[PDB]
């Protein structure tokens, strides 16, 4: 007693729906369905989502609302030995904001350049173009498309950089976009969930408005059904594939936000007797549904290119920034009223990353605010200093070799770090803290205990599900490379430190305050294995 609270449920839901729904719902999910043989991929997707994904999503939102405090204090009051988990989780989201915000900037950059008629990326006639330029996507690497050379040779200017060691000059139009992004995030998270809850009303809802338009505009185009085939046409042969179950497991986990401390932070502002089990199920469904819907949006346009524009589906069907910043814009340029589709598309991409970035920063702020009252009393100054650190370091990704810096963090930062973090989150709650003890916490909140189905997934399924993704991730590991460029072995090591920077906090904090308390284990051990009972 006591803590600040939400402005009412729709704010919380939109914040969670906002954080959960990002570009991964767009440039990733639809691709996996295509690669994994269509609606058949939904089987391993739905299964991995039900047993592994939701229970983890449910779990964080539960004890997030129950303990009513940030990730650091929450795990400190839960399993003081594992408090380091809260530290790891927070600084993981700290690393992500160094890069992930760049995607929003790129979206704003394309938004500014899309004001004009005759969109710049529709022609090889321009000044930044190579003789190897093509009108649209192809096979051979040496020859790129028009929309591809615009992104690389104009916006990113990645051609100037020979690698990560050379970042080249700082691009200020790009630095301007990054600053604009950090400004929006500041006047959002400025006063906290008071303003934050209201802003997500736009950022969360807007993407669905544009999705509906592009969904209609896409299906109104020739060959749109051909794209839907490449999208949802079932191959159940992939069901027996190991990589398919891995991709479904991986996507389901990363699509939802568990382990980032974001859900934990957002839920901590909930009313104690609020029903999380309803919110968790609702939010989860809306997330996957959005990906499914967006899938039709992409492949409707993708199939359109294969039909009218005469390009192989294998070439135009892709994932990540390449899809949204290159492939899709290329199709929009061909359509009538090009400028309109381009403007709303790029605005959607920005609003898709914004509410996702809000939760990320909030996870840091809330976790720290509860831990340290000094930055709890001073808010506006803290977030100003935080985003200042982001912008300065973020200038590294605004350079000419910025993508090389971006791609380094993308792979290493949160990739292998959070899997082990959430694995300890699952083990701590289900075993150290115990399931029967956790189930009782939920009963006191929502009125009823979790079904034994949820108990089993937390204690057994989740841990195996996590190691399953982690084990195969390590076995299928390869040195970091982008395009024809291979990262130096020192660059790889620099990313493992970042990946280890978080994870190491868990055993570190476990050892640190293990030597702080008196007595002898088990006595010292049992003190840290006991929750906060007063």
């Amino acid at each position: 007693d006591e803590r600040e609270t939400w402005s009412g449920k729709v704010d919380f839901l939109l914040s969670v729906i906002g954080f959960a729904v990002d570009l991964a719902n767009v440039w990733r999910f639809p691709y996996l369905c295509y690669k994994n043989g269509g609606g058949a991929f939904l089987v391993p997707y739905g299964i991995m989502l039900a047993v592994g994904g939701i229970p983890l999503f449910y779990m964080e939102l539960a004890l997030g609302q129950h303990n009513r405090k940030g990730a650091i204090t929450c795990w400190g009051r839960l399993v003081p030995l594992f408090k380091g988990i809260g530290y790891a989780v927070v600084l993981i989201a700290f690393y992500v904001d160094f890069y992930y915000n760049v995607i929003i900037a790129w979206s704003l950059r394309f938004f500014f350049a899309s004001f004009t008629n005759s969109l710049p990326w529709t022609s090889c006639n321009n000044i930044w173009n190579t003789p190897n330029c093509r009108p649209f996507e192809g096979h051979v690497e040496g020859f790129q498309s028009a929309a591809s050379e615009y992104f690389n040779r104009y916006i990113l200017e990645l051609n100037r950089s020979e690698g990560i060691h050379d970042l080249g000059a700082i691009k200020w139009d790009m630095a301007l976009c990054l600053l604009i992004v950090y400004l929006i995030c500041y006047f959002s998270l400025w006063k906290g969930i008071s303003t934050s809850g209201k802003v997500v009303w736009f950022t969360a809802l807007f993407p669905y408005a544009v999705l509906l338009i592009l969904l209609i505009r896409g299906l109104t185009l020739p060959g749109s059904f051909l794209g839907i085939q490449y999208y949802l046409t079932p191959n159940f042969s992939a069901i027996y594939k190991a990589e398919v179950w891995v991709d479904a497991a991986t996507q389901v986990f990363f699509s939802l936000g568990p382990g980032f401390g974001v859900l934990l932070a957002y839920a901590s502002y909930n009313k104690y007797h609020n029903n999380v089990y309803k919110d968790a199920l609702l939010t989860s469904f809306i997330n996957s549904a959005t990906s499914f819907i967006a899938g039709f949006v992409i492949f409707s346009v993708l199939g359109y290119m294969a039909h009218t524009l005469g390009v192989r589906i294998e070439d135009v069907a892709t994932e990540g920034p390449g899809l949204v910043f290159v492939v899709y814009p290329a199709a929009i340029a061909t359509m009538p009223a090009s400028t309109f589709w381009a403007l709303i598309f790029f605005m959607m991409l920005a609003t898709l990353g914004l509410d996702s970035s809000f939760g990320g920063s909030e996870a840091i702020i809330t976790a720290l605010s509860d831990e340290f009252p000094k930055i709890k009393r001073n808010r506006e100054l803290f977030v100003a200093g935080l985003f200042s650190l982001y912008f300065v370091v973020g200038l590294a990704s605004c350079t000419q070799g910025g993508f090389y810096f971006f791609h380094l963090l993308d792979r290493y930062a949160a990739g292998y770090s959070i899997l082990v973090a959430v694995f300890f989150e699952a083990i701590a709650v289900s075993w150290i803290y115990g399931t029967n003890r956790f189930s009782e916490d939920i009963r006191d909140m929502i009125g009823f205990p979790p079904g034994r189905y949820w108990q089993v997934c937390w204690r057994f399924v989740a841990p195996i599900f996590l190691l399953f993704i982690t084990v195969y991730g390590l076995i299928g590991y390869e040195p970091l490379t982008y395009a024809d460029y291979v990262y130096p072995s020192w660059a790889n090591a620099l990313g493992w430190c970042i990946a280890g920077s978080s994870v190491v906090m868990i055993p570190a904090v476990a050892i640190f305050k293990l030597l702080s308390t008196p007595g002898s284990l088990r006595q010292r051990f049992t003190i840290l294995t006991t929750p906060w009972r007063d």
């Epitope: 029967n436 003890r437 189930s439 009782e440 009963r443 006191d444 009125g447 009823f448 205990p449």
Partner: antibody
Framework: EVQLVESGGGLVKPGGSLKLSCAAS????????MSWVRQSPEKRLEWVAE????????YYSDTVTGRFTISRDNARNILHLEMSSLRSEDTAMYYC????????????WGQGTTLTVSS | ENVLTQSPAIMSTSPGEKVTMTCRAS???????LHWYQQKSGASPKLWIY???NLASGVPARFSGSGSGTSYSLTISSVEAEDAATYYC?????????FGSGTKLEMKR
């Protein structure tokens, strides 16, 4: 199947103290939460106190608050109600019930045990 | 405290007829948090209707729950002699938990 048996209780002088016990069987005791509900000689049902499945979260009525203590033994599956400074208004038949799911109300009730506070 | 009031206090009915007893709360109660209990003479109370609608195991279909907010009702389509007892409505919505005044159902002859 499920059976609850209230034991103890009887004549007690005003200001005195007594302990009631409920023997639970037929179900896992640690899983379900328990509550004490008393019915006065005027047949008015009044909820007394509720204990969690692990005996952590506790709730009392404003009537018996501070004068009553509800305990739990999950080893022997025994529910306990510790009374002190009993008044005449506390005279009723005390029931043992579960008590777990708020939306399902009280699953099963004991046969009840009678407590009479008089001089 | 949330005061649940039930009426009528005592009710006489001939077997086969339709009886309706209401429940009224000081504060609004969740429709899933309102339950009904049937206590026969010299016997312990028994869970009858929970969540305002759903019956319990062993409860005949002749019983039906209804209502919401501050007003609820229990209805017996065709009353039988074995249905004569005192019925208590109760809310789990918030602490302290409270039982209705109860409606005593007696058979008319």
């Amino acid at each position: 199947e499920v059976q609850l048996v209230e034991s103890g209780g009887g004549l007690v002088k005003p200001g005195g103290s007594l302990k009631l016990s409920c023997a639970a069987s037929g179900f896992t005791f640690s899983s379900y939460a328990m509550s004490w509900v008393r019915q006065s000689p005027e047949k008015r049902l009044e909820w007394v106190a509720e204990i969690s499945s692990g005996g952590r979260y506790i709730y009392y009525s404003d009537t018996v608050t501070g004068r009553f203590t509800i305990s739990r033994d999950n080893a022997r599956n025994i529910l306990h109600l510790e009374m002190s400074s009993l008044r005449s208004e506390d005279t009723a038949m005390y029931y043992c019930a579960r008590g777990e799911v708020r939306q399902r109300g009280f699953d099963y009730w004991g046969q009840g045990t009678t407590l009479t506070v008089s001089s | 405290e949330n005061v649940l009031t039930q009426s009528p206090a005592i009710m006489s009915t001939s077997p086969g007829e339709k009886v309706t007893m209401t429940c009224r709360a000081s504060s609004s109660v969740g429709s899933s948090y309102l339950h009904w209990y049937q206590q026969k003479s010299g016997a312990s109370p028994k869970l009858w209707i929970y969540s305002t609608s759903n019956l319990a195991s062993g409860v005949p279909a002749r019983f039906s729950g209804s209502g919401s907010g501050t007003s609820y009702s229990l209805t017996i389509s065709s009353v039988e002699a074995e249905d004569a007892a005192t019925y208590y409505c109760q809310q789990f919505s918030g602490y302290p938990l409270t039982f209705g005044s109860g409606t005593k159902l007696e058979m008319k002859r």
